[PDB]
Scaffold this motif. Structure first.
Motif, PDB file in Angstrom:
ATOM      1  N   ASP A  58     -33.701  13.981  88.933  1.00 32.56           N
ATOM      2  CA  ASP A  58     -34.575  14.422  90.026  1.00 32.56           C
ATOM      3  C   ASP A  58     -33.830  14.419  91.461  1.00 32.56           C
ATOM      4  OD1 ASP A  58     -34.781  11.821  90.422  1.00 32.56           O
ATOM      5  OD2 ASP A  58     -36.714  11.517  89.745  1.00 32.56           O
ATOM      6  N   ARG A 218     -33.400   2.746  87.558  1.00 33.51           N
ATOM      7  CA  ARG A 218     -34.330   2.038  86.668  1.00 33.51           C
ATOM      8  C   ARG A 218     -33.276   1.661  85.411  1.00 33.51           C
ATOM      9  NH1 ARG A 218     -38.463   6.899  85.225  1.00 33.51           N
ATOM     10  NH2 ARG A 218     -36.678   8.315  85.841  1.00 33.51           N
ATOM     11  N   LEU A 250     -29.598  11.204 105.614  1.00 33.60           N
ATOM     12  CA  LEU A 250     -30.484  10.402 106.259  1.00 33.60           C
ATOM     13  C   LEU A 250     -31.498   9.612 105.297  1.00 33.60           C
ATOM     14  CD1 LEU A 250     -31.738  12.535 109.066  1.00 33.60           C
ATOM     15  CD2 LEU A 250     -30.238  10.617 109.227  1.00 33.60           C
ATOM     16  N   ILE A 253     -29.237   6.957 103.357  1.00 31.19           N
ATOM     17  CA  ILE A 253     -28.975   5.983 104.317  1.00 31.19           C
ATOM     18  C   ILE A 253     -29.970   4.850 104.302  1.00 31.19           C
ATOM     19  CG2 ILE A 253     -29.080   5.675 106.871  1.00 31.19           C
ATOM     20  CD1 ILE A 253     -27.830   8.438 107.438  1.00 31.19           C
ATOM     21  N   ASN A 254     -31.261   5.180 104.596  1.00 32.46           N
ATOM     22  CA  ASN A 254     -32.307   4.190 104.760  1.00 32.46           C
ATOM     23  C   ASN A 254     -32.779   3.531 103.360  1.00 32.46           C
ATOM     24  OD1 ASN A 254     -32.715   4.356 107.554  1.00 32.46           O
ATOM     25  ND2 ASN A 254     -33.482   6.698 106.948  1.00 32.46           N
ATOM     26  N   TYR A 257     -29.819   0.894 102.562  1.00 30.95           N
ATOM     27  CA  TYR A 257     -29.855  -0.321 103.384  1.00 30.95           C
ATOM     28  C   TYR A 257     -31.243  -0.977 103.326  1.00 30.95           C
ATOM     29  CZ  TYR A 257     -32.358   0.807 107.926  1.00 30.95           C
ATOM     30  OH  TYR A 257     -33.229   0.932 108.616  1.00 30.95           O
ATOM     31  N   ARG A 258     -32.220  -0.124 103.206  1.00 32.79           N
ATOM     32  CA  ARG A 258     -33.445  -0.965 102.701  1.00 32.79           C
ATOM     33  C   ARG A 258     -33.246  -1.918 101.490  1.00 32.79           C
ATOM     34  NH1 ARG A 258     -37.173   4.020 104.149  1.00 32.79           N
ATOM     35  NH2 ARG A 258     -35.980   4.653 102.258  1.00 32.79           N
ATOM     36  N   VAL A 260     -30.811  -3.286 100.688  1.00 34.13           N
ATOM     37  CA  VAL A 260     -29.903  -4.493 101.091  1.00 34.13           C
ATOM     38  C   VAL A 260     -30.978  -5.398 102.002  1.00 34.13           C
ATOM     39  CG1 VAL A 260     -27.864  -5.498 102.124  1.00 34.13           C
ATOM     40  CG2 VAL A 260     -27.743  -3.314 100.668  1.00 34.13           C
ATOM     41  N   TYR A 261     -31.634  -4.857 102.733  1.00 32.06           N
ATOM     42  CA  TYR A 261     -32.522  -5.753 103.610  1.00 32.06           C
ATOM     43  C   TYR A 261     -33.474  -6.547 102.840  1.00 32.06           C
ATOM     44  CZ  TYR A 261     -35.909  -6.716 106.983  1.00 32.06           C
ATOM     45  OH  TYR A 261     -36.955  -7.377 107.907  1.00 32.06           O
ATOM     46  N   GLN A 262     -34.154  -5.582 101.966  1.00 35.34           N
ATOM     47  CA  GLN A 262     -35.421  -6.336 101.199  1.00 35.34           C
ATOM     48  C   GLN A 262     -34.713  -7.178 100.223  1.00 35.34           C
ATOM     49  OE1 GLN A 262     -36.806  -2.527  99.859  1.00 35.34           O
ATOM     50  NE2 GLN A 262     -38.338  -2.711 100.972  1.00 35.34           N
ATOM     51  N   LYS A 264     -31.918  -9.190 101.173  1.00 34.04           N
ATOM     52  CA  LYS A 264     -31.776 -10.257 101.781  1.00 34.04           C
ATOM     53  C   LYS A 264     -32.968 -11.200 102.142  1.00 34.04           C
ATOM     54  CE  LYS A 264     -27.745 -10.807 104.952  1.00 34.04           C
ATOM     55  NZ  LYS A 264     -28.354 -11.703 105.811  1.00 34.04           N
ATOM     56  N   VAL A 265     -33.857 -10.168 102.517  1.00 36.78           N
ATOM     57  CA  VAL A 265     -35.375 -11.230 102.793  1.00 36.78           C
ATOM     58  C   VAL A 265     -35.728 -11.849 101.759  1.00 36.78           C
ATOM     59  CG1 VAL A 265     -37.787 -10.495 103.088  1.00 36.78           C
ATOM     60  CG2 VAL A 265     -35.932  -9.268 104.666  1.00 36.78           C
ATOM     61  N   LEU A 266     -35.857 -11.494 100.402  1.00 33.62           N
ATOM     62  CA  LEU A 266     -36.206 -12.112  99.205  1.00 33.62           C
ATOM     63  C   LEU A 266     -35.128 -12.929  98.642  1.00 33.62           C
ATOM     64  CD1 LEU A 266     -38.315  -9.009  98.503  1.00 33.62           C
ATOM     65  CD2 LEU A 266     -38.909 -10.764 100.165  1.00 33.62           C
ATOM     66  N   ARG A 268     -33.151 -12.164  96.277  1.00 38.97           N
ATOM     67  CA  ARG A 268     -32.757 -11.643  95.048  1.00 38.97           C
ATOM     68  C   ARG A 268     -31.804 -10.211  95.293  1.00 38.97           C
ATOM     69  NH1 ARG A 268     -37.133  -8.660  91.468  1.00 38.97           N
ATOM     70  NH2 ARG A 268     -37.945 -10.702  91.192  1.00 38.97           N
ATOM     71  N   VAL A 273     -22.969  -5.008 100.313  1.00 40.58           N
ATOM     72  CA  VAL A 273     -22.144  -4.024 100.901  1.00 40.58           C
ATOM     73  C   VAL A 273     -21.054  -4.811 101.394  1.00 40.58           C
ATOM     74  CG1 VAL A 273     -22.081  -2.275 102.583  1.00 40.58           C
ATOM     75  CG2 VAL A 273     -24.527  -3.221 101.586  1.00 40.58           C
TER      76      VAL A 273
ATOM     77  N   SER C 229     -30.004   3.734 112.638  1.00 39.21           N
ATOM     78  CA  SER C 229     -29.738   3.035 111.204  1.00 39.21           C
ATOM     79  C   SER C 229     -28.459   2.621 111.204  1.00 39.21           C
ATOM     80  CB  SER C 229     -30.246   4.024 110.010  1.00 39.21           C
ATOM     81  OG  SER C 229     -30.452   3.209 109.000  1.00 39.21           O
ATOM     82  N   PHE C 236     -26.846  -6.355 110.047  1.00 38.69           N
ATOM     83  CA  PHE C 236     -26.884  -7.107 108.712  1.00 38.69           C
ATOM     84  C   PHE C 236     -27.755  -8.288 108.841  1.00 38.69           C
ATOM     85  CE2 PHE C 236     -24.350  -7.627 104.770  1.00 38.69           C
ATOM     86  CZ  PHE C 236     -25.062  -6.555 103.960  1.00 38.69           C
TER      87      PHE C 236
ATOM     88  N   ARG D  89     -35.561 -15.259 110.444  1.00 39.84           N
ATOM     89  CA  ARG D  89     -35.415 -13.790 109.902  1.00 39.84           C
ATOM     90  C   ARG D  89     -36.019 -13.038 111.165  1.00 39.84           C
ATOM     91  NH1 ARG D  89     -36.098 -14.746 105.475  1.00 39.84           N
ATOM     92  NH2 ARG D  89     -34.029 -13.701 104.678  1.00 39.84           N
ATOM     93  N   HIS D  96     -33.886  -4.216 111.987  1.00 39.93           N
ATOM     94  CA  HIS D  96     -34.327  -3.423 110.694  1.00 39.93           C
ATOM     95  C   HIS D  96     -35.314  -2.377 111.400  1.00 39.93           C
ATOM     96  CE1 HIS D  96     -36.957  -2.793 107.159  1.00 39.93           C
ATOM     97  NE2 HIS D  96     -35.523  -2.649 106.577  1.00 39.93           N
ATOM     98  N   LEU D 102     -42.692  -6.625 104.292  1.00 43.35           N
ATOM     99  CA  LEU D 102     -42.842  -6.227 102.749  1.00 43.35           C
ATOM    100  C   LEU D 102     -44.518  -6.872 102.624  1.00 43.35           C
ATOM    101  CD1 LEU D 102     -39.454  -6.689 101.140  1.00 43.35           C
ATOM    102  CD2 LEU D 102     -40.852  -4.691 102.108  1.00 43.35           C
TER     103      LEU D 102
END
Ligand SMILES: Nc1ncnc2c1ncn2[C@@H]1O[C@H](COP(=O)(O)OP(=O)(O)O)[C@@H](O)[C@H]1O
Ligand SMILES: Nc1ncnc2c1ncn2[C@@H]1O[C@H](COP(=O)(O)OP(=O)(O)O)[C@@H](O)[C@H]1O
Ligand SMILES: Nc1ncnc2c1ncn2[C@@H]1O[C@H](COP(=O)(O)OP(=O)(O)O)[C@@H](O)[C@H]1O
Ligand SMILES: Nc1ncnc2c1ncn2[C@@H]1O[C@H](COP(=O)(O)OP(=O)(O)O)[C@@H](O)[C@H]1O
Lengths: 382, 351, 382, 351
Positions: A58, A218, A250, A253-254, A257-258, A260-262, A264-266, A268, A273, C229, C236, D89, D96, D102
């Motif tokens: 897809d 998946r 584009l 891109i997002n 890094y989304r 990687v960010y999410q 980093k935030v959580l 897991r 990178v 971005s 990072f 953060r 970001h 989130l």
């Protein structure tokens, strides 16, 4: 005497040489039975088939349907993509969808449908083993294109002209490939053959980008360790390099890094990178180093693009007769003719690899093909 | 007079040109026996969708693919893409990576197509009526009657007649001038995409007025939506730009609702054909309000008295959208109308 | 003895030193009357005023409001942008507007409003003429910052520390400026002083992009001849260069090549993009050449960005005492202190030009300021 | 017992925490005489907006700026931004370049705020009723009556009482289980942003169901809109992904309209306070259907019999939007309620 000399023999039958095959058909319609162009194409593969390696089911196309096999040369053609939609009853649904970019799979079926109508133009499973020159007054009047079946018999194809669209090949320093070191094109035929894992994606371009994403997918609860408009008006004017001869997405891109960010935030982080030698693959993956870290994993993919097949082997004797640049790379005329001299009376034309590399292409397939065919017909008479 | 033609068409704007193009591509493929003889009669002395022949330099909100021909036959010499090829602008446009050409390109494309089809049309002819040609209370064909600019009258036998006279501004009780197209301290108008006029007005005081995605274009411009909300938001502190844009009664102003401060603005509706029909208007089925019913093949619903057809290509609903008569079905409806005419031409008649 | 020595004197009062001035206020609130930090700032301009050169009245900001003077150091501050909105009653309308990027003019008024509350912290119209060291045991205990009014009187400002936020200056080879050769910052003060014309925009970045567009503008029927971005996750992690010390707009991209395309299509090209020496400005414009075309016009703008003021003059004697790199460029500590040695007992700190250039900035103004202030308070005691 | 508090609040979810935060920032600025003594009573033993304490990893469709406090006071230690700063953060998030955090970050932010305000709340307390404290048929204040998990009863004098018990699923005649949150060949449900559940269902057969821009958020997600229209368009040839998603009567299936193939799905409505009011319910003005009328200051409309107030912070309309009770006015309404309580505390009473 079952083989008289043809106007053109083309080597390979992917898109590039299929686009050409189409113009031979459309030309033969306009002209009478006396000016027909006799073209045969030879494909080593037993059947038509673009790339098996990037069938992400897809993904949308990076390129607009207008860049099909035919339209930039002739927008009124029965073998445009819109034309194929009309025959499967999808033209309205496609016209209404109000996009330029269909899915990569519709183009595949379109290619298959074009290649199907033009099936008379090709012998598949015939691997060209050389282009050998036929000489008279020290002049090569035509060529014997020599081809081998998969059962060993050899065949001869006399042709005043030869067209090379053999396609391209994986690539700068790294020159090896085993059971645990893949190229970007091998990913599907190999993902379907591995079954928490670890990866590493050297690369560049959207090629390497597409693996980092699907290595997630998946699919993997595991680790994966990465290592449009500029050419909409860089094309500018329809003049090109005739005044002077006188890799990102584009959305991806997002999306990455989304991740990687999410992650980093959580905490897991399935992703890692990297930014900035020898490899020692034993049985436990590979011991490749970076300037220093002799990183190890299970598998290590790349994405340094593709390069055109080198024709010297195929040229055999004729390879010597071809003008070279200051590096011994093949020079190429404006009409896509190899520069051979007046010694050689027919032409050897090039689609594909001409100048560039690195692109997982179709940018000008349609117009180049017709320009070649007209060059061939011009050289046949006034 | 003439021999009876397969179809005579009234008007030569975009709608009828698509049909004309469709008539030609038919006459090429079929033999000399299945040729369709179609004539078109245009009152204006020359083709011009816009009679003002001096429109904008914006992009079209409709994809070029809705050109006169493509959606019926994407392999046509008279697609928009073909027209670009003939001007050598086909490559520039493919590279430009758009679905939406400039407003002038489609106009020039219309003009270019209408020139290729000059043989199918007579200009300067105002059709004044269809009087039915009867034997036995049965209408075998039609005399399309037309008058030039000098009063002279001419007649056109046709088994079928196609109406694509175009449309009309929609105005309730009040009509004046001193409409949405005609462009001081008070004027007037209104509309649903009148906002698209409101936007450029920036840079004097004037007065004007989800479950939407399935299957796509099978049913306002989001970008102008945003430009307008930008403009009003950015306009904290300072009111309206260069003017005083705002959005019912009558050196003249009009009051409006409970408290309120001569060109117009609204939508569109198709020309009423009753006049042109005369006698036959009564032969036509109507709905519970006496409005003209129209078949699936775009035929006026006339009795079994009438053996040939009267078709409508000129769009028959209250469109409320200029330059969108293409996003309809001009190309495909034209071909559907054309196919209706060749079919009734061979049947030995079993009811 | 009306001048005792202050904890800090800052040179310049643009954003960078205003951000710092704010932390001196917020610090003084938390601490008692014994640990107050005594800070004075000196601005040469008679009043607060950022850049007068890029006030395009309906441009949005390239940067999110979160990068204001204060928030990345203290998100609970009475001098955040959101805080300023609240005082003008625009917080809700702004919160509802559901954007990160306000107009460039709201930030200007925000800067003015911050600079207004902190008006006691500054003397305007005072031009620092030098930082001269005050010596005892061969040790510089503090500095006499010397300042001159616009009416000639000279003043002395004793300070244990000096902070440099003088701002920046136009720029690599081209080193001249007349009545017909402008810098990108001069465009407004000069467009409002010229009244079919001709331009030429050398440049790079969005700086040069913004002139090509406005040279069109609601304005010129004339010629104009041009010559997000990636750092959202290149930032990072909040770690930066402490492991190792141990320029485009998608909307303007399309808007300009749109203009060139639509002008190519319709013939009426107000625009002319170019791709690839000496100048000889006479009275009829200028005779500058390119590798060759000695192109001539009315005016020729640039956009090679900006550079930080060179402090050597201001340092006077102390300039010699500062560590240098292998090129004689000033080294800078991690706490933004010029590297002077134990000879020099107070610090000389740097906002602004630190390392980079080329940016018409605020990326870290807030946190750098607080880090400097804490460095100053740490050095004052345990 | 207790002395009478300025306010006792019922429930401690997001709505009432915003108020609690607002009560604290007030008590700091004012002297020891203008302190507001507010107690909150939460039935659950611990704070948890979601009692399931295991939600998604999508982004929020609402900008972080709609946190408990910001829209009333952007300089608050309990903004979302403050919470990030306290976790280091804040820089990552500014870089970001998003408005939308989130789903888990806001949950953790709620939890972090609720921890800072532990002193203002008693958990494990189920408020069972407000019996009015009368002298002279006049209610001077209220006894909020509550029972722990062990049956013990306690009483709380308060001049004012604030209801933010949260909301309830909306279901017509049919209610079963074997709702939109509870997540085989047939289940059931429906909704207007149930589409947002429909989208991820891709990757078994189930059963479910302009002039909009002026002044912005002063009044579906376009991206999921598109993903769904993509998904259905891309799904020419092949039906629904992994399931059979489709959009009225009752090992059990239900028929629906003229021809049609046990969890639920719908919207939300606020808890009915009648039970909690008991006696006082009749003291409350109603509309032409007997529904509770509510003042501008979010006060139940009680007679002059009743001198203190009963306020509603817990959102009082049929929201139809989970995690959107913030895009309302929790922060600002909370402060507005708080200001109402300090005002009625000083007036010498002129009517
Ligand atoms: N020596 C050869 N003889 C016959 N076919 C060849 C030879 N070398 C390559 N080919 C074929 O040429 C085709 C090139 O197709 P492809 O790589 O898809 O690109 P293109 O679109 O440029 O034709 C392939 O099908 C490949 O198998
Ligand atoms: N009675 C008539 N006889 C001939 N031509 C007519 C008559 N009435 C209208 N027309 C012409 O029909 C044309 C309809 O064009 P237009 O409004 O552009 O139609 P479309 O919907 O096809 O775009 C106009 O050029 C108009 O001048
Ligand atoms: N020697 C000096 N003495 C006093 N002020 C100075 C001196 N040199 C520069 N300035 C001022 O310093 C200020 C720097 O402001 P600005 O350039 O807007 O950037 P920043 O945001 O980095 O402070 C300007 O107002 C300028 O006039
Ligand atoms: N009678 C009651 N006594 C005490 N607490 C209650 C009572 N009824 C409901 N609650 C609590 O009120 C809280 C409301 O929280 P929530 O539904 O998240 O509200 P909000 O709209 O503030 O997000 C819940 O934690 C619930 O357990």
């Amino acid at each position: 005497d079952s083989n008289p000399v043809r106007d053109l023999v083309g080597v390979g039958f992917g898109p590039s040489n299929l686009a050409l095959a189409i113009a031979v058909r459309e030309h033969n319609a306009q002209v009478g039975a006396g000016d027909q162009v006799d073209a045969r194409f030879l494909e080593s593969k037993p059947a038509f088939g673009w790339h098996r390696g990037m069938l992400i089911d897809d993904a949308t196309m990076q390129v607009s349907f207008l860049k099909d096999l035919v339209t930039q040369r002739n927008p009124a053609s029965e073998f445009s993509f819109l034309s194929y939609l009309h025959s499967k009853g999808r033209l309205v649904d496609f016209i209404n969808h109000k996009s330029l970019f269909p899915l990569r799979v519709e183009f595949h079926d379109y290619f298959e449908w074009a290649a199907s109508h033009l099936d008379d133009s090709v012998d598949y499973g015939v691997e060209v083993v050389g282009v050998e020159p036929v000489v008279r007054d020290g002049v090569v009047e035509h060529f014997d294109v020599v081809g081998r079946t998969a059962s060993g018999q050899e065949m001869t194809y006399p042709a005043r002209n030869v067209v090379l669209a053999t396609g391209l090949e994986p690539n700068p320093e790294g020159i090896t490939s085993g059971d645990r070191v893949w190229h970007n094109s091998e990913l599907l035929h190999r993902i379907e053959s591995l079954p928490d894992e670890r990866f590493v994606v050297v690369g560049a371009g959207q090629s390497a980008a597409e693996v980092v994403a699907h290595l997630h997918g998946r699919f993997q609860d595991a680790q994966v360790s990465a290592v449009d408009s500029p050419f909409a008006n860089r094309i500018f004017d329809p003049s090109a390099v005739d005044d002077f001869y006188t890799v990102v997405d584009l959305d991806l891109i997002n999306d990455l890094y989304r991740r990687v960010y999410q992650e980093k935030v959580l905490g897991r982080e399935r992703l890692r990178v990297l930014n900035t030698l020898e490899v020692v693959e034993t049985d436990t993956g590979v011991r490749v180093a970076v300037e220093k870290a002799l990183l190890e994993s299970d598998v290590v993919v790349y994405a340094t693009g593709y390069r055109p097949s080198d024709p010297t082997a195929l040229l055999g004797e004729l390879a010597e007769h071809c003008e070279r640049d200051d590096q011994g790379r093949y020079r190429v005329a404006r009409d896509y003719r190899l520069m051979t001299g007046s010694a050689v009376r027919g032409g050897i034309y090039l689609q594909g690899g001409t100048e560039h590399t690195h692109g997982i292409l179709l940018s000008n397939t349609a117009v180049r093909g017709g320009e070649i065919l007209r060059s061939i017909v011009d050289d046949r008479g006034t």
